Every structure is written in C-alpha cells, then in structure tokens.
Amino acid sequence: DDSGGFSTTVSTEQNVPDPQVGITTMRMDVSGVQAPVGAITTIEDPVLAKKVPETFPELKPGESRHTSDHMSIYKFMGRSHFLCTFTFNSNNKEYTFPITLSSTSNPPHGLPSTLRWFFNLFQLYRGPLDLTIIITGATDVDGMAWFTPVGLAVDTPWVEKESALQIDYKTALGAVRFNTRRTGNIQIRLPWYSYLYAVSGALDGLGDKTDSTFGLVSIQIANYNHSDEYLSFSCYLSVTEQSEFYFPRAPLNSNAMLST
Amino acid sequence: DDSGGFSTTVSTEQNVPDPQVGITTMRMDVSGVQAPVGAITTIEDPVLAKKVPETFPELKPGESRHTSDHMSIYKFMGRSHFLCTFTFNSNNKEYTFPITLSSTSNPPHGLPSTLRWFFNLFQLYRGPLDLTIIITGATDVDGMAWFTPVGLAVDTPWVEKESALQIDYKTALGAVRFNTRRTGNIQIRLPWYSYLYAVSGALDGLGDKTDSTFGLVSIQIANYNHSDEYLSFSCYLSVTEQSEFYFPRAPLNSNAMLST
Amino acid sequence: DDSGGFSTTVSTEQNVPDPQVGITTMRMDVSGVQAPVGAITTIEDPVLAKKVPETFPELKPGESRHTSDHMSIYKFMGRSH
Amino acid sequence: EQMIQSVDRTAVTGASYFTSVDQSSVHTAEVGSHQIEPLKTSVDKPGSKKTQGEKFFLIHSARWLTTHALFHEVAKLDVVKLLYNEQFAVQGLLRYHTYARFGIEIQVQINPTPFQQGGLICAMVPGDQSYGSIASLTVYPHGLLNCNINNVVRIKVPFIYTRGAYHFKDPQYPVWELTIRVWSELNIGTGTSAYTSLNVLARFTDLELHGLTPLS
Amino acid sequence: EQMIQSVDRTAVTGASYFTSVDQSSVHTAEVGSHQIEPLKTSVDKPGSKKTQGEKFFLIHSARWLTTHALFHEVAKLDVVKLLYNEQFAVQGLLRYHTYARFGIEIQVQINPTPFQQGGLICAMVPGDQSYGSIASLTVYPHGLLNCNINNVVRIKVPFIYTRGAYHFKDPQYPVWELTIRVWSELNIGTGTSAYTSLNVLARFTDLELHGLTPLS
Amino acid sequence: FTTWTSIPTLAAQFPFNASDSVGQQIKVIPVDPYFFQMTNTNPDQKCITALASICQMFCFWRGDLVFDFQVFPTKYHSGRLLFCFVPGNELIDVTGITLKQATTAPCAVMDIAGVQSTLRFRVPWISDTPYRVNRYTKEAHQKGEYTAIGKLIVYCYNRLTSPSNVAHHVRVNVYLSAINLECFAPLYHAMDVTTQ
C-alpha cells in the first residue's frame, strides 16, 4: 500500500458496480440437493455479505419474451421527458432559461417529474444531452435559438423580458435560424461547454448554484404578433450515448418526487 | 547570396510561423536535474532569443480532455459571425451592401464586432467566404440575390433606393431565385472574383477603398407589401477552407473593438 | 547533487589536507627554459589559485641530512610538555 | 599556445521551484562529504512524506447514549476540515502547498458493554445529506455496528469532487461528510451503564502537492 | 466439510511512527483507485523534501560603507539560527522534527560600482571567533571579494560540531558563524556613490530528520 | 493562433528606483493572459498585447505563461531582485506578505549587473480547477470562478547602488509570452484596461 496503513484482516472490493444485466436468460437446479450456504450469513462483515442468496431449492425461470432490453439507462432515459414550457406576451420578448440539476430548485423553476428523480440518482455528470423543442400556436412568427455556456454575460434566468444582448454576441456563439411555419420543431444536441470537470446534481450552499449548471438554451422571437392566438413553446430532454455516470446515490424520498 | 550584401555574422530564420499546435498532449521531466539554460538569455540578439523557455523543474501537464480542437482558424472562425442587417420601406427597394475589410469604416457601415478584429490580424487575404442570410418578417414577398465583382457598374453602396440596373445585367452575372415562404434562409458561397492578387484589410489613403474590397452581395425584392409587418434581413459571414493567411499583424487596440 | 543547487561553473576541492611531506628530498630543472605559469595568477578564484608557485628558473635543493623526521605531529608533540 | 581560463558569467543553479540565473558567477567550492552515522542514535526511519501525512488522526469524540431515538444523526462533521487544524502534523505539509488531491481512509472504533443492545450506521456521503434516504444508505460504502459481534470497521473511498485539486482558503462545498445515525435504539435495564464511547480515526491516502504559496 | 471463516481479531496497521494494535478488528474495505491527471493543471514537480528544504534563503541584508576602517567585522550572525524563523518553508519541516544533521551551503552576492576600490573577506568559522587570527583567516575555506574582477563566490563546508545531531530548543554553542570583515577600505572621490549592498544566500545540504516531537 | 501568443509583447512597465527600502513592494501583477495596461495619447489608442486579443475571444483558458523582465541599466548599476510567485486568486490582501515568508513560495533570484538582460520567468499552472473561466464578461464577483492562477511580486531584494553621472532608476519592461496554451468555448468580449 502506498500510504502505510496496515491491518490484521483484508478489506475486499465492496459494492461492485453493475452486478447483473437485467435480462432473464441463461448465461438443472440453481439450488437443490446442494445445501444453501447463503441462507444464513453475517451482514456486518461485507466479506461474508458477498455470499450468493438462496433459501429454497430452485431452478431457472427461463428466457424472457421481449426482444428489446429495458434495464439500461441508454435505452430507458432515451425516451425523452419534460423540462419546462413558456409563453409569449409582446414583441421580441427573448426568453432565457437555464438547466439546473439541483433538487433545491423546485419546479417549474427547476427540475420537473422524471428529471428531478433522475438527476439525483448519481453524483457527478459529464457529457451532452438531447434537446427536442416543439413550437405550437400562432403563425408567421420569426425565431432564433442559440447556446451560451456558463461564466459569461447572459440575460436574467427564467424571466421573460427584452434582451439586453445584441446580434453580434448571440450569433458569434453558435445559433440556428428557422420559421414557425416550415417545420415547427427542432431536435438539437446540447454539447458539453464547461471549464470544470463534471457537474453534480445534489448540492447545498453556494456551490449548488455554481458547481451544477452546465448549459443554457435561450430563444428570441420576431414578427409578433398576428390575430389573437397563443404561442407556447415546449422543451424536452433525453440522455445521449456520449455521457457517463458516477457513484450510485440513494434515490429521492417521496416528498421530492413532484411534477408540474 | 544573390544580392552581394556580406556580413561578419549569420542571420537566422526569425519569427517562425506556427511554432506549436495548441493541443496539450504528448508528442519524465521537462526540466529538472538538468539546469535551465533558458532561464537567463539575451533578447536583443534574435539568435539567442530562440532558446527554450524554462525557469522551474517541471514535468508534463498531460493530455487534454476535449476531443475537438479549438486552436486553428479553420475551426474557430468556422462558427459564423455578424456582418450587417437592413430593413425595407417600399416596393422593389433593391438593397446593395459591399464587404469592406478596412478598419477605417466604422460599423454599421463597415466591419462589426468579431470580423473587425479578425480582418485586421493578418495582412493579405486571398480566397472565398461563407454567406448565410436569414429572412424574417412579412409573408408573400418575392426576392432575388446575386453577385457582382469590383470594377463594374453597380448601385450606391449601403443606400436603399430604387435600382437603376435591369434584369439583363443582374441575371447574366449569376443569381438565385427563391420565395420568403418556402425556406426563408440561404447558405451560399462567396467566390473569389478579383483581378488583383490579394486584398488587404488595414490600409489608408486612396488605396484603402480600392485594394481591400473583393465582393458585393445585393438583394432586390418584389410583391411588397402586405398588412403592416416588418421585413428584416440578416447577413452573416464565416471563413471557408479554401483561403489562406499571410504575415501575422499586431491586433487591434481596445478603442477599435466595437460592436453594432 | 543530492540537494539541487545548480551553478554555471564548477567548484573544485579547496584547501586540500596535507599537501606535502616536509622532508626535502627527491620524489634537472624545476623551472627553467619552460616559462613560469604560476608567476602571475588570480587569487580570488580558488581554481586558478591551485597553480604551482614559481618565479625563477630553479633546480632541486637536494636530499636532507638528518635521518629522523620533524614535520609530523606524531613525532613533534611526542616530546612531552 | 597557452590559455588561462576565466570564471563563467552565466550560471543556472538553485532548488526545485526557487530558480535564479546570475550574471556575475563564481565557482561553488565543495569540501568534505555528507557523513553517515554507523552507531545509529535513531533506529527508525527519518521524517518523510510517506510516514507523516498518512497516519490515523482522531478528529472527533462523541458519546452515543441510550436516550437517542431512532434514525438520530449522532455525528455530523467534515472529514477534510477537521484534518485542517493546528494540532496535527498534516498542518506542516499543507500550510505551504495550496492544492490538494487525496483519498479518504476511515476507521471508527466504539466500545459497548455486552449488557446493552443496538446498532449504528457509518456511511460516507459526498457533498451533503440534502435529499438522500435514511433507509437507503446501504448503497453508499458503509460499515454497520453491532453489540453482538464486532466493534472495528474500515471504509476506503476515493476522491469524489467536482474538480481535481482542492482549495483550502475558500471551498465551494465539503468533499466528504461522514455520517453516523442511530440504526437501532440503545436499551438498558437496571444497573447496566447508560453510556458508550465513539471515536473516528481518519487519514489521507495518495496525496499530491502543487503550487506553493508564500502566505499562510 | 464446510467452514465459515470469521473476522480476525488482531491487526497491525497504521503509519510509519504512529503504531496501533487492536483487539477488535474488521476488514478494511477499499474501492476505486488513486487517479492521475493527464491534462496536468500543474506542470512542475509536487512538494517534496528534495525541493523544499534545500533552496537558497536570504538571511541577512547589510550595507558595506566607505567609513569603515580596516579589519572591521561587517557581519556577525548565526547561519543555523537565522534559518530557524517563521518566514521560511524550512520551518515547516523542522517544527515537528527535533534532531538535525546538515551541511552548510553559502553564496554571497555584493554589488559595487566600478568607480570604487576595496575588498572583503568571507570565512566560515566553527563555534566562535574566540582567539583566531584576523590575518590567518585564509586557512579557513573562504572566498574573497574584489572591485576589479568578480562579485559572486560560493563556499561548501561540512557539519563541524562536537556531536552528530542538533537540538533546536537549547543549543550548546552555534555550529557555524559566517564572518565578513573589511579586507581593504572602500575609498571614493567626488560624485562616486558612498554605498554598496551585501546579501547572504544560505541553504542546508544533506538533511536528516529523527525523533518526532508533539510540542512546537 | 500560436504565431501571435508566444511572441513576447509588452504588457506593463515599472522602474527600479534607488530611494526605496529593502523588501518594499514595487508592483503586484495578476498573472493571466488578460493583462495589459499601456496606452498612448497621440494617437488616441490603448495598447493591447498580442496574447490578450487571442484569449479575450474564449470562455475558458488553460496553459503556462512566460514573463520576460528586460532591464535597461548602465554597466555600473547593481543590486538584485526577487521574482516570487504567490498563487491563489486575484482578490486577497497580498500586500501584507513578509519578504522571508515569500521564500517558501517558488521564486527566482537575479543579478542586475551583467551582459544578459532578459530572464525568461515561466508560470506554472497552480490551480484548483482544471478549466479557468473568463470572468470579465460578468460584472459581479463570485467565489469559485477566477481568472488569475497566481500573483507576481517584484520585491526590493536589495537597493540600487550607482555612480553620480547616471540617473537613480533602472526601468524594467514586462513582455508577455506563453507556452502549452489551450483555449475553447468562444465568445466576444472587448477587454478593459487593468489599472491594478
């Protein structure tokens, strides 16, 4: 050992990540004439807690009968979920919302139903996301969407007002241009623009508003308005296959899993 | 030597272009038990100014942790930036703006924020550009865009008026045809139509308005107007991979980096 | 060096213990047609202070004429005081 | 042809970080040698980084009583901050060096009398106990306590932090937070003692030092 | 025949000097590994004994003037005691470790204007200048100074002491005593500046550490 | 963009007077690529360094820095200096450090006299975060986000001795060059003159 802390016993590898793939398949009797050794054990020792669990003479349940797999995050959170929604009141009211992974920020100004539970199951996060926005409402409205990383000048979060920024600062960072009559929906990546190593969801203090945020999606509109009709935008998120996960955390209690 | 100017010493190759690729990667100790020879030196001699800089016993910082590269102009100015914007007042008001690389032409009638600093970092320029225009506003408006090189008859720069030109002169040079309801945006190259060798950004005198310009983008509209709604066009620029750069110049001072 | 104090020059071994046994004996000319290099020198540098001293063309004084030796402490302070 | 060599003017000498280059130089003379001691007046190893900065340091002393209810948090502390104190030898290495990168070794020893009953929990929590479940703490690398079998456990966890190096003067958030909660209530009858002690022995593992500072 | 193994009771673990043996033991669990940083946020070597405790330390600043007579002692100090001070990084290694064994590296830099004249002496004296001759100081390992040629010298001397290890709290006598005396008087005319500086850069060589103390 | 950065460009200016005390602080420098203070009255212009214009178009930066302190004395001046590196952030009470407390931090000694002027002092990456943000886009201070990985202090390690027929000051220029430099996440921000 590099440190020099010696002991009379041996500490083994505790809490092994991903012990089993959740497909029920074959990879005689599981228990039977052979006696169950994992029927009785000692749980205070993590060495003897590694014993195989059985109490009954068993055999195989068999092979599962769905072709797809629904036990990995790459194909469970791939189905997208809700983040936020917002409306419009007057001409060129640029909207700005951040993505904050904290559980202190209660929804609608924070994390809603599925993403609040999912962004507090694991400690650190490092990687991109999928963003699918939906435009529904009035016609002949011009718009523009762009990205802005943390640690820069940007407008006020979650407040719809006139933008103090200009076309030189918005377009030099990277943007798209569309119209609400052609397609009305955008599926766009959310790249990892962060100077720090990895963001963490559950924090408190002054580090929760600094060591959790990793991105900002902000929209400016134009050619508003026409005859009186609502103009509502939607924002969904889904995980991508480029990110990873770290240090499995205890899940959220029943008083935090709330929806909008 | 072809000229015959002899000297007692030898002049070496000073100010070597592109000394390092800015990725932090491996290509033991950098300094250490070996003594620093570049700690003390003489800077008036450019031969001894070529010595490797160190003052501390060091080692490698390591390999960088972003897959992309953000230290070449081919992937830094590839993200497009602002050039100009303009509106409309009446029917068939053909707009004409040139692209002038001078720093004397203050924005909006010249170079705005990012392109003003970028078109004064290098002396000569020879190659094409990327043009992405965005149409936002009123509906059912006809339009047409075309190119016109320097040294020809064209309308007045940066002034929106009725075009004195005709459909034979505009279409024989090369043009596109679209509608503001179908797509509303055009991504178009800007080819190098110039009789001179290369254009230069920073100039003064009568050569600044002659040995800097290399292109002109001009738009005529029709089917205007409809019910009262604004009609604003945008014009962005980005560099292409067909151009080169020459003679690295000192950057712009803090009193010139201005935005629109 | 075990410490890490580096220098541009080299420090040599200064003030060498017991440079000579004081018997006057043989162990031609000492100086002569060969020019004296230790006539002029620099004494602030201890490297160039290690130069052999001469200023005159010389030769050997010869072998001493007492059998005993009176230039070591083992036979000088051996007589009690 | 004879040539009298002179003194060199340029010299690059010094220490690891302290670097000096002189225009007026001289030859560094050297006499003798670093002498070793054969009749050793010190039979152990000298002071080094390997034996000083990695040794078990008691950081807190509380006492688990019988009047505590279920799931009551016995200890709530910072493992990194309590190791930052004047009364330890790890103050001597961390005072000149600002940046820090370390793993956390934990050993907790308690002493119950065998006429009591009850159990404790000892989990290692990154950041804070913001919204983690009390009943789901075994997903964390933990070690339980029992009045029946054992009284010594050990937990080895790595550096879990949003960044790589650590700043002592202004931390964003605590790196690890050792928690101890009442897993089972401590019951007594008549005559059995109503107190039992608790101690936390913590030390660093795999320490790096970077970027020396002149300030304290 | 099956056998359920249990936890070992005796365990010999710990650090270099801090040694503990427990009667109630448990298996020390270990997860993860000590992670290295490939994109190095620190390009130099980490803090160690080799780069910290051996680096040139300015200990005294005096000024050799023109009004000094012949054979006047400019500096009179202790090289070991001035290195024992709060404002250095060698305080951080010597505060927990009592015993000391070290060689003495000396570099002295002065700066005269070339319209002056005179010379100095820099000898290294063990113990004291009790009855040593001023005119016979060149037997000592010394380095002279001149207004003509040079301004940087260096002296490397070994540990000259009646014992092997050193005690910081109550010394019997000073180990080395750096002396600087006027070897030639500093003369000026009219307009030439009447001051020239003097600095002593000293550091330890070949340090040993033995016998850690709990007191400061 | 390596062609503009590692070429040594002037960023500051400080002389070395003779009317100062031993250990008196002359000039404190926030060590960053964002460092420039010189200007000109005729024409109306504020002098920029070639390193700062490259790095003012990014959100983050990472890499080493090399200062070049070139003196212009006569051949008869003397004295020494101490180029100490005090790490941390841009906002502490840095002007309370004792001169012997600066000996714990990494440093470099230097003689003024001689026939070589420029000492190429290189800055290591002493930092807690691997990515160091451009905070100058914002206008509110915040702990956690920094811009300087250290602060340079040129101490008065010794005084200035000189003859009568020259002046009593030795000017030290401050070039600015860099090595192993890395920048990503572009922006646009026109920097302001740091008046220390």
Side-chain angles (χ1 to χ4, degrees), chain E residues 10 17 27-28 31 42 46 80 82 106 123-124 139 146 170:
Chain E
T10 63
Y17 287 94
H27 290 87
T28 58
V31 293
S42 296
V80 182
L82 290 175
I106 296 298
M124 296 302 294
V139 182
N146 191 359
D170 196 1

Side-chain angles (χ1 to χ4, degrees), chain B residues 140-171:
Chain B
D140 293 331
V141 173
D142 193 77
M144 179 179 70
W146 63 93
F147 192 75
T148 302
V150 298
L152 290 173
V154 77
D155 290 327
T156 60
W158 295 96
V159 174
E160 185 179 2
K161 69 178 181 66
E162 294 291 327
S163 179
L165 296 174
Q166 69 273 15
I167 201 65
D168 290 331
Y169 181 74
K170 291 175 186 178
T171 58

